[PDB]
Every structure is written in structure tokens, then in C-alpha cells.
Design an enzyme around this catalytic site. Structure first.
Site, PDB file in Angstrom:
ATOM      1  N   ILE A 256       0.793  -1.255  -0.145  1.00 50.70           N
ATOM      2  CA  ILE A 256       0.035  -0.150  -0.036  1.00 50.70           C
ATOM      3  C   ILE A 256       1.188   1.255  -0.564  1.00 50.70           C
ATOM      4  O   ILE A 256       1.570   1.442   0.998  1.00 50.70           O
ATOM      5  CB  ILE A 256      -1.146  -0.442   1.087  1.00 50.70           C
ATOM      6  CG1 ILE A 256      -1.872  -1.262   1.039  1.00 50.70           C
ATOM      7  CG2 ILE A 256      -1.863   1.117   1.498  1.00 50.70           C
ATOM      8  CD1 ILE A 256      -2.190  -2.056   2.453  1.00 50.70           C
ATOM      9  N   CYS A 257       0.284   2.309  -1.388  1.00 51.29           N
ATOM     10  CA  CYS A 257       1.688   3.311  -1.049  1.00 51.29           C
ATOM     11  C   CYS A 257       1.036   4.571  -0.210  1.00 51.29           C
ATOM     12  O   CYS A 257      -0.077   5.285  -0.328  1.00 51.29           O
ATOM     13  CB  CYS A 257       1.190   4.126  -2.386  1.00 51.29           C
ATOM     14  SG  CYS A 257       2.792   5.071  -2.409  1.00 51.29           S
TER      15      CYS A 257
END
Length: 153
Positions: free
Chosen positions: A90-91
Site C-alpha cells: 500500500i502506498c
């Protein structure tokens, strides 16, 4: 003498209670297999997203030195999204260099939910998906919906 994991364990237990008592909408999380450091979370796809109807599972590993380092969080349900790669990474800045010990797992989950409703195409983990989100939004919506159907049902 205490265990070196004492301050992390104390912190995780508190976070578990807080999450249990007031979870971010449409989320839940807690220990899997009685390991206080290994949790799973579930996010139901938000009503305003093409993820609606879906159930999305995430793995959370807390480090021994929690809360002074961020948790590792990954999706294990496949998801079509500019900020989440096929490894489920996840960014989110707070999961990288911007963690603070003031933050909590409830805040991480709330931020992820926000991302699903509102992708950040200017910060892409999957540039192709970002480009599609920006230039052909109907296509992004229908592929997101298709994958939700195939993987999150």
C-alpha cells in the site's frame, strides 16, 4: 526483568481495545492464531467506490519495537487500484517514512479506507492504473468492479 516486547505488546493491546470499541466505518481487525503481533483486518468496499459489495482482507505485522516503527500492512485480497500493487503493498506515507508513534492501527485503517474511495494518482505504485484513473475513469471503475466481483466475493 520484562520481555523486550513488553512496550509493544502493551500498546497493541490498547489499540485492539480502542479499535474494538470504536472501529473506522466498515473495518475490523485483530490477532490471528493468538499472536498479538500478527493481525488480520477486513475492509468492506466503501459504498462510494467501485469496490462496493466486496470483502477485502489485509495482513498486519507489528514490529517488536512498535510503536516506534510502523506496522507492515498488505492486502491479501486482490484489488485493482493505483496505490496498491499485486503484492498487496500500500502506498501510504505513514507506512513508509512518515510513521509517528502517535498514530494507531485505527488511523492506518481509516487512511486505507479513504484511499479506496479516493485514489492518489499523483503517487502511483501502479502507474498504468493511475493513468487509467486519470484519463479513462469509466474504465477504471468497471475493471475495479470486475475484480471486486472475481476476487472479493
Amino acid at each position: 526483568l520484562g520481555s523486550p516486547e513488553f512496550m509493544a505488546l502493551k500498546r497493541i493491546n490498547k489499540e485492539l481495545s480502542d479499535l474494538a470499541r470504536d472501529p473506522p466505518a466498515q473495518c475490523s481487525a485483530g490477532p490471528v492464531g493468538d499472536d498479538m503481533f500478527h493481525w488480520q483486518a477486513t475492509i468492506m468496499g466503501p459504498n462510494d467506490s467501485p469496490y462496493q459489495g466486496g470483502v477485502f482482507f489485509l495482513t498486519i505485522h507489528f514490529p517488536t519495537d512498535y510503536p516506534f516503527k510502523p506496522p507492515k500492512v498488505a492486502f491479501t485480497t486482490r484489488i485493482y487500484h493505483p496505490n496498491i500493487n499485486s503484492n498487496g503493498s500500500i502506498c501510504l506515507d505513514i507506512l513508509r517514512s512518515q510513521w509517528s508513534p502517535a498514530l494507531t492501527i485505527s488511523k492506518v485503517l481509516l487512511s486505507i479506507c479513504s484511499l479506496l474511495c479516493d485514489p492518489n494518482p499523483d503517487d502511483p505504485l501502479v502507474p498504468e492504473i493511475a493513468r487509467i484513473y486519470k484519463t479513462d475513469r469509466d474504465k477504471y471503475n468497471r475493471i475495479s468492479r470486475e475484480w471486486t466481483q472475481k476476487y472479493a466475493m
